[PDB]
Design a protein around this ligand. Structure first.
Ligand SMILES: Cc1cc2nc3c(=O)[nH]c(=O)nc-3n(C[C@H](O)[C@H](O)[C@H](O)COP(=O)(O)OP(=O)(O)OC[C@H]3O[C@@H](n4cnc5c(N)ncnc54)[C@H](O)[C@@H]3O)c2cc1C
Ligand SMILES: NC(=O)c1ccc[n+]([C@@H]2O[C@H](COP(=O)([O-])OP(=O)(O)OC[C@H]3O[C@@H](n4cnc5c(N)ncnc54)[C@H](OP(=O)(O)O)[C@@H]3O)[C@@H](O)[C@H]2O)c1
Length: 532
């Protein structure tokens, strides 16, 4: 499917963000096309096919609300949609509104330059395509460029090498093999208990132990669902007016103010129920390092109470960083896994990896023989995908350069000096600190209403104001700084990628507030933008 030479709005990416952009611009009467590297729709859920892949936000929440038809017809099956089912949903949504005729697949965008002469962007691909668009929507994701560490012997490994984020399309057989996994972020924790069932040995290469809590996944009762459907927009609307974009109860109490007996009884109740909801058990879990510690420790005794070898258990216990400052992971049978004879924890904090060999992984302590090695080493996050593209603004300024000391944006949506360009659900915004559907819907709607507003008013150049951008970056940092978020090396902060600026990259005031700010801005004629 050839891309058009000329288009009102060009969209990069056909995951959730891109598809909505496409749908909406068409609804608004604008011409619009999508360029996507993948072979089909899906984005993260197309790429991440490792066995176990599964959302951490509940199925009833992690979905589109923009269409009534879709809420009424689609039927989710479990509390947490596995990867194949979310893919199925996205294909369902693709068909329904005939989105594929808007999309060139197998094509990567490689450069994009703004031409002040004509207020347009000109966009280039590895297929040689060149597109002229008035507006450029980058919907190219938050976690979309796989981060494989440059472990010294990587290219010499004689076995099979994987990355969870670029997973093969046919199912991989690990039966009888010695398998290692590096990384115990949630990919690692999700993929490992699956490989453990097939492998003769599983070696789990852990560095910083992350906090995970049980998911308590269950079947979803068709009755619950049917009741839900009657009141569905009302439900999403409730979700939309929360810090997190989902139905978390926001605990009024401070975790220091309660007694021991009430704390344990509270948290036990969260632990039986499962889910990320513990995160907001007490209003100060992310604000005060002592409040934090009272919750963390409770989790830590859980780990020590689930793992039968008390030495391995201690190795598994999260240390060194505040609870919740790394993405809090939902585990299904990850800890019980280590009770199996064929599962082994390699603590690379205490024995670091020296090199990959052709037979396996060498630490300072021993060499581990492996047929396969799986990299759950995460993603060059938030900026990665933009950075792989040579984006050029007014004065021929590289985006890569303007952003070399960290992302600089006004509301995350735009960056001054690069008019007519927008970033869906990324730095300087709520992004992954919330149910991403909610964050993605608001950004698609806000941006595309914006474009329609430029067209209804016969305008052609929309650009953020330098002072307002600076005032936004300062604000993001200032408020991040009253949380424990900047205290740890997480991908939120860039520190997972050696050399990458460590700045906490996201808006932490919560979805709801960020939307209001965005509505106040839009209502005033898009204050902090200069439209001509
Ligand atoms: C394994 C995993 C699970 C997730 N689970 C959750 C969850 O629990 N809760 C939640 O809220 N969200 C979750 N996320 C976050 C996730 O990023 C969002 O939920 C959402 O799927 C991102 O959608 P998107 O359209 O914004 O970006 P993506 O789905 O990443 O789509 C971006 C697309 O753009 C394409 N692209 C990038 N560069 C180019 C290029 N130059 N040329 C052409 N195409 C390009 C990519 O191929 C990709 O398909 C998860 C992320 C991962 C990695
Ligand atoms: N169920 C879900 O919702 C889900 C699933 C997957 C991903 N995601 C999203 O995408 C993010 C990515 O998570 P992820 O599982 O892909 O990975 P991640 O959270 O980035 O963690 C990567 C893991 O690899 C380790 N690591 C990185 N570089 C290393 C090196 N050079 N040597 C040894 N270990 C190294 C890290 O150890 P250290 O932490 O100590 O550096 C960490 O264990 C998640 O936090 C979440 O936002 C969500």
């Amino acid at each position: 499917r050839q891309p058009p030479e000329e288009v009102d709005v060009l969209v990069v990416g056909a995951g959730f963000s891109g598809l909505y952009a496409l749908y909406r611009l068409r609804e608004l009467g604008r011409s619009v096309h999508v360029i996507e590297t993948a072979g089909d729709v899906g984005g993260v859920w197309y790429w991440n096919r490792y066995p176990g892949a599964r959302c951490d936000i509940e199925s009833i929440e992690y979905c589109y609300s923009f269409s009534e038809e879709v809420l009424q017809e689609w039927n989710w099956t479990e509390r947490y949609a596995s990867q194949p089912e979310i893919l199925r949903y996205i294909n369902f949504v693709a068909d329904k509104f005939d989105l594929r005729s808007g999309i060139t697949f197998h094509t990567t965008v490689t450069a994009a330059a703004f031409d002040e002469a004509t207020n347009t962007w000109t966009v280039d691909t590895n297929h040689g395509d060149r597109i002229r668009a008035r507006y450029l929507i980058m919907a190219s994701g938050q976690l979309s460029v796989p981060q494989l560490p440059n472990f010294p012997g990587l290219k010499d490994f004689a076995g099979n090498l994987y990355h969870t984020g670029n997973w093969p399309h046919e199912p991989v057989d690990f039966s009888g093999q010695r398998v290692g996994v590096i990384g115990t972020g949630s990919s690692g924790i999700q993929v490992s208990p699956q490989i453990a069932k097939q492998a003769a040995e599983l070696f789990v290469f852990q560095r910083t132990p992350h906090f995970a809590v049980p998911a308590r996944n269950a079947p979803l009762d068709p009755e619950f669902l049917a009741d839900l459907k009657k009141r569905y927009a009302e439900f999403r609307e409730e979700s939309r007016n929360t810090p997190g974009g989902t139905h978390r109860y926001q605990g009024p109490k401070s975790a220091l103010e309660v007694s021991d007996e009430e704390l344990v009884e509270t948290l036990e109740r969260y632990w039986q129920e499962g889910g990320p909801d513990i995160l907001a058990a007490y209003r100060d879990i992310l604000r005060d390092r002592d409040a934090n510690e009272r919750v963390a420790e409770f989790i830590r005794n859980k780990i020590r109470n689930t793992v039968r070898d008390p030495e391995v258990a201690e190795r598994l216990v999260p240390k060194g960083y505040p609870f919740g400052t790394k993405k809090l992971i939902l585990e299904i049978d990850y800890y019980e896994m280590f009770n199996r004879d064929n599962v082994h924890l390699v603590d690379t904090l205490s024995a670091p990896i020296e090199t990959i060999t052709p037979r396996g992984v060498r630490t300072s302590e021993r060499e581990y023989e492996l047929d396969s090695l799986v990299l759950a080493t995460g993603f060059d996050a938030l900026t990665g995908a933009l950075f792989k593209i040579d984006i050029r603004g007014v004065g021929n300024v590289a985006l890569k350069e303007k952003w070399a000391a960290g992302p600089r944006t006004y509301l995350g949506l735009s960056t001054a000096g690069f008019p007519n360009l927008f970033f869906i659900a990324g730095p300087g915004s709520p992004s992954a600190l919330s149910n991403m559907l909610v964050s993605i819907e608001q950004h698609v709607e806000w941006v595309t209403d914006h474009i329609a507003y430029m067209f209804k008013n016969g305008l052609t150049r929309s650009e953020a104001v330098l002072e307002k951008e600076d005032e936004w970056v300062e604000h993001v940092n200032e408020i991040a700084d009253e949380t424990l978020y900047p205290m740890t090396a997480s991908w939120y902060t860039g520190a997972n990628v050696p050399g990458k600026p460590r700045v906490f990259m996201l808006y932490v005031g919560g979805f709801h507030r960020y939307r209001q700010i965005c509505d106040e801005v839009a209502a005033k004629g898009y204050e902090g933008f200069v439209l001509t």
